[PDB]
Design a protein around this ligand. Structure first.
Ligand SMILES: CCCCC/C=C\C/C=C\CCCCCCCC(=O)O[C@H](COC(=O)CCCCCCCCCCCCCCC)COP(=O)([O-])OCC[N+](C)(C)C
Ligand SMILES: CCCCC/C=C\C/C=C\CCCCCCCC(=O)O[C@H](COC(=O)CCCCCCCCCCCCCCC)COP(=O)([O-])OCC[N+](C)(C)C
Ligand SMILES: CC(C)[C@@H](C)/C=C/[C@@H](C)[C@H]1CC[C@H]2C3=CC=C4C[C@@H](O)CC[C@]4(C)[C@H]3CC[C@]12C
Ligand SMILES: CC(C)[C@@H](C)/C=C/[C@@H](C)[C@H]1CC[C@H]2C3=CC=C4C[C@@H](O)CC[C@]4(C)[C@H]3CC[C@]12C
Ligand SMILES: CC(C)[C@@H](C)/C=C/[C@@H](C)[C@H]1CC[C@H]2C3=CC=C4C[C@@H](O)CC[C@]4(C)[C@H]3CC[C@]12C
Ligand SMILES: CC(C)[C@@H](C)/C=C/[C@@H](C)[C@H]1CC[C@H]2C3=CC=C4C[C@@H](O)CC[C@]4(C)[C@H]3CC[C@]12C
Lengths: 602, 602
């Protein structure tokens, strides 16, 4: 694995230092021995192709480093050579150690300011505890050294330089934990840009501004907004400000800033939506267009489900041609064949409802399937914010409807099976529209967080308890007459009865007109204590204990689902229903830009 | 008892001081009277064989002590003589009182630095509020007096000296509450050791390092780690450190450090497992070997339970030879005798499943019973962390399986009884494997903490309520026809029905075709209010109120169960499946030691 390999690389590096007297002296800073060694091989390389001057820079030994450079000035220009450290120079190491005097001493000897630390230790990865890109300037900026950054710019470090992810030093600063020092560095780097470095995309296609949204860097986002706002006036406690919408509203682009924020896997990304500019734009969009249109789509989908339900109530059945020869058989009706299912005016009225049902199932797939491809299936079905579990069940519903149509056209028996699933999944998918309402939306997120959390854990241990007790009840009743107590008469019935008895949805079996086996009363007393008194009430207790913890995240997720709905509706609906948001600058001599005006009290 | 004896010892001591003018003067420090007394018996002894110089040292009376020593220098060498205080000298007392000048005055007169306070007041026990071992140096160290410790070392106090538990001053310092001052003292004492005192075991077989793990002394453990770590390099925000695994991983030893920590009765011991070295070693062991092998053992045990369950479903039964002459008798099948139970190919297929069932029951006892002997039964079955309640039920399961085999071989009727218990206990023991999963493990600890806590308290008061109401319902129905209401027709049925009615698992008995006794409606209304409205819902309330309090400990116990599982699997499984953990130093010129490399951000 990567851990045992990186560990071995570090062990070999330390051994090759111990085993080589020049590298050992470069580590210890014992100038005595280092003078004797250098007085009479300077190109000695440690385990990763690093020089004695890399070793001196790592241990921050300026005296050993200057003594090595006086003996062999060429060492300042040397990269390391083996996979984790490829392209790392002594300048990269000195910059990480913030040794300004060693950085001056290396630059005075022509250490390259444009050298790339290409190796696996510098790539953005869960394997690496930091990501500073590949260039000495990016290292100096992430390390927070203003003076080393100026010094590197004065030696001609290219501020536009991009690493193997396409990230510029501005993208790399958005990715750092030290957000306030990163904002101070971001102004310093923007000062040397006199087309802008803020507009350069990485290989994901993201500008620094879009990356601050995706990564949920609210401190860098509100900093980037200071160059995109204009204060129109202040009057006593009131200010009117005008915010440039260009990089937020993302007009005509296939993948907007707001879509990149609501579809981001970073939990912090949803905090960008609470910023004054994003929140007030998405609140306006939801008030004026999103809620009205989402209420119309909720209404149309409910009418479509009432239509489909009515087609199931009026489903074509006839008297069974076969005989109920078995006394346990209760089936009296049967499916009509296709050639006898469409005869009456009522069958033609149902054919219109069935054609509406099939048309809406086709429309669901035409609306759903392209968004799987845009978003990618694991992000599309996985994200709560986008509607993930509802997309699974609405596609499953449309698939079961089209399967049922194939069964109807082919005289296939058993339409009850896909129709019963489609009635449950079709109606449960009406809970998708709960996101439009503050009353229902946060509660629908609790339902989901309880299904994937507490209900999952419970059903795993509940199933183990049901297997034990169903088997004990079944073998307890194997010797007894099934007509006097039916609940455990075969093993599938014993499982189902034990499941219903666990949940207390069927009464505990009793028949006071006969002697039940004594082992039933013993087993059922233990079951009643374990399943109903303890586990069924402990479920309520652990749900109550989850509920108060999850409640703050439930509300943050609901507010983000409203924005994701707004972004989805504006993307998918006809543009004549969604007029461009904010204020057109061309009406006021401000150019082609669009704005949001926010007036606030302070 | 010990309390009334120690109290009497203290009362007699104070009386013998009051009754003896020299000891009374040694307590008061009235040098006037003490001069008159000493001018013309110095060997006067208080209630515990203590001298007037012990009394002067106890009351911290340096002037009386020096005046007593000037009259009788031999008193500095005297021990106390009666059971609680045997071997205590005036030096032990002066050291506890931190009187450096009295310690100098006693050492100047040859008070023994190697004297042992052998008496019952100095032994590690719940009877004693402190434990400083038996020697003046251990007293000075636990009292925290650096200057008295140096002074005693300068007078030749043996730093290797061991008390009646085999504890050295280092072991005794791990046992003190003042952990940060104890670490400062631990460095001072290690400085005089120039085979090491850190390697000396006590009579439990524990070194100071193992004792810090067992006692959960995380402050002393992280201090002891500072002499067992090497910083390989630091580069900007990153450091790589190498930790010596020798005393943690405990190779080839019959009882490891990690086993001593997970099996400790101290609740603080589980905090040692969260230290960087222990946590990262046990996390690696669990990731690479523990979880994969525990998932295989979970799978094999579930397949074994499905096999046993199938042998119970296909259990050999025939039509009853006897007649159902009683109209209340519902038994229609009976056990086959052994000589008719193995005839068909299906019986031979079941014999293979029954031989697998018996083989796994023998294997369970071969795996379980030796670990009872290693750990000791009360620690083995008592500890949640080790699997205690699951070890009880898995041994009970294997015992019921082997009992059932003896019943099968002997034509003994009633195999339903041990098989019904074995099906419940065998399946409920699958919850042992819940510890391997973050989803199920903490919840399985809540199940256990609720069974032993809230369910226990509830079942005690619930039983008292059922006894009252079952008796009232039984005598209410004694005069009435059992065929019209069967629930209370005899006292065992009335108990069982009242138990099912308490839990609301059977419907309240009613028969609108007859007049029930009016006393039933009155009694059942009171029962319905007390049992179902109040107590059954108050159970949910007290569980909810336990759940939020226990939730932090539940997670700490789960994280410790994962480590205990890892330690158990590595101990019990073949060593070719468990390669030695960490980094072999011999590959890198570091010797025979093994290491963990931890790289961290700061
Ligand atoms: C199941 C449906 C069985 C239907 C059937 O086929 O049940 C039985 C056969 O299966 C069985 O024995 C069931 C064996 C046990 C199966 C356990 C289920 C799997 C559990 C896996 C673990 C899941 C949780 C793991 C922990 C998280 C059919 O026999 P019967 O009940 O109709 O009649 C009684 C039997 N005679 C014919 C002799 C009269
Ligand atoms: C119990 C099973 C009795 C079976 C039986 O033997 O019950 C009765 C005899 O015992 C009894 O009276 C039961 C006496 C009360 C026993 C109470 C149980 C012990 C509780 C101990 C305290 C526990 C909690 C303490 C506080 C934490 C058998 O009479 P029967 O009900 O069959 O018929 C009705 C009676 N004739 C024959 C006249 C028609
Ligand atoms: C035998 C059939 C009828 C079985 C398989 C049916 C199961 C359905 C009812 C289950 C499967 C997944 C469940 C489910 C998935 C996720 C969510 C999202 C949550 O925010 C609201 C509830 C909701 C919508 C629930 C409702 C009930 C569903 C849809
Ligand atoms: C406890 C958790 C794990 C939940 C999810 C599981 C419930 C189990 C016990 C349920 C789920 C569906 C149930 C089920 C489905 C349908 C039938 C067909 C019927 O003719 C006999 C019973 C039988 C075979 C029952 C047995 C019990 C089952 C398998
Ligand atoms: C009449 C028989 C069937 C009676 C005696 C059976 C009782 C069983 C089901 C009881 C006895 C002890 C109970 C028990 C003991 C302790 C634990 C550990 C806990 O972390 C998970 C639940 C678990 C495993 C439960 C499950 C149910 C058990 C095993
Ligand atoms: C309320 C708590 C204390 C729980 C643990 C106790 C429940 C009691 C009421 C249960 C446990 C087992 C039950 C029980 C076992 C088996 C039988 C044999 C049956 O032919 C008559 C009823 C009888 C005798 C009932 C009576 C009620 C008992 C004794």
């Amino acid at each position: 694995d990567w851990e045992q390999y990186r560990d071995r690389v570090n062990m070999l590096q330390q051994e090759r230092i111990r085993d080589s007297p020049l590298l050992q002296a470069a580590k210890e800073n014992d100038l005595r021995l280092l003078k004797i060694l250098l007085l009479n091989d300077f190109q000695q390389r440690g385990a990763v192709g690093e020089t004695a001057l890399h070793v001196a820079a790592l241990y921050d030994n300026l005296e050993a480093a200057t003594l090595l450079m006086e003996a062999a000035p060429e060492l300042a220009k040397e990269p390391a050579l083996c996979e984790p450290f490829v392209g790392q120079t002594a300048l990269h190491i000195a910059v990480m150690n913030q040794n300004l005097n060693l950085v001056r001493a290396l630059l005075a000897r022509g250490a390259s300011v444009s050298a790339r630390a290409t190796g696996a230790a510098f790539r953005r990865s869960p394997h690496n505890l930091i990501y500073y890109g590949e260039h000495p300037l990016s290292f100096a900026a992430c390390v927070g050294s203003e003076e080393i950054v100026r010094l590197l710019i004065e030696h001609g470090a290219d501020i536009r330089a991009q690493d193997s992810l396409g990230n510029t030093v501005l993208h790399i600063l958005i990715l750092q934990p030290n957000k306030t020092f990163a904002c101070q560095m971001y102004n310093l780097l923007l000062s040397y840009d006199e087309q802008s470095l803020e507009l350069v995309p990485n290989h994901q296609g993201l500008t620094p501004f879009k990356l601050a949204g995706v990564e949920g860097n609210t401190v860098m986002f509100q900093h980037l907004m200071q160059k995109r706002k204009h204060v129109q006036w202040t009057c006593g406690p009131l200010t009117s400000t005008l915010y440039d919408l260009t990089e937020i509203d993302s007009w005509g682009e296939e993948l907007s800033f707001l879509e990149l924020v609501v579809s981001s896997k970073k939990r912090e990304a949803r905090q960008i939506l609470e910023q004054t500019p994003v929140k007030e734009l998405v609140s306006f969009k939801w008030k004026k267009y999103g809620r009205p249109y989402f209420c119309v789509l909720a209404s149309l989908y409910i009418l479509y489900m009432i239509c489909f339900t009515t087609c199931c109530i009026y489903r074509p059945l006839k008297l069974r041609d076969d005989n109920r020869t078995d006394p346990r058989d209760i089936t009296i009706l049967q499916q009509k064949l296709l050639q006898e299912a469409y005869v009456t005016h009522q069958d033609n009225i149902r054919l219109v409802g069935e054609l509406v049902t099939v048309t809406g199932a086709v429309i669901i797939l035409l609306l759903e399937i392209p968004d799987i491809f845009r978003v990618g299936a694991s992000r599309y079905f996985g994200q709560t914010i986008l509607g993930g579990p509802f997309h699974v069940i609405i596609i499953t519903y449309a698939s079961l409807v089209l399967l049922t149509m194939v069964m109807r056209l082919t005289n296939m028996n058993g339409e009850v099976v896909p129709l019963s699933f489609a009635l449950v999944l079709g109606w449960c998918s009406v809970m998708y529209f709960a996101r439009g309402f503050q009353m229902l939306g946060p509660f629908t997120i609790m339902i989901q967080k309880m299904i994937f959390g507490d209900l999952m854990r419970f059903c795993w241990l509940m199933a183990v308890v049901i297997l034990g007790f169903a088997s004990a009840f079944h073998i307890t009743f194997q010797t007894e007459d099934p007509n006097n107590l039916g609940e455990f008469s075969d093993y599938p019935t014993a499982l189902f009865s034990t499941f219903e008895l666990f949940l207390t949805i069927i009464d505990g079996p009793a028949n006071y007109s006969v002697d039940l086996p004594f082992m039933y009363c013993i087993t059922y007393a233990a079951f009643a204590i374990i399943a109903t008194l303890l586990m069924l009430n402990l479920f309520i207790a652990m749900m109550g204990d989850t509920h108060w913890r999850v409640a703050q995240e439930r509300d943050e997720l609901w507010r983000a689902q409203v924005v994701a709905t707004t972004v989805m509706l504006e993307r998918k609906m006809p543009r004549f229903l969604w007029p461009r948001s904010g204020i057109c600058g061309y009406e006021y001599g401000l150019g082609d830009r669009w704005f949001l005006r926010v007036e606030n009290h302070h």
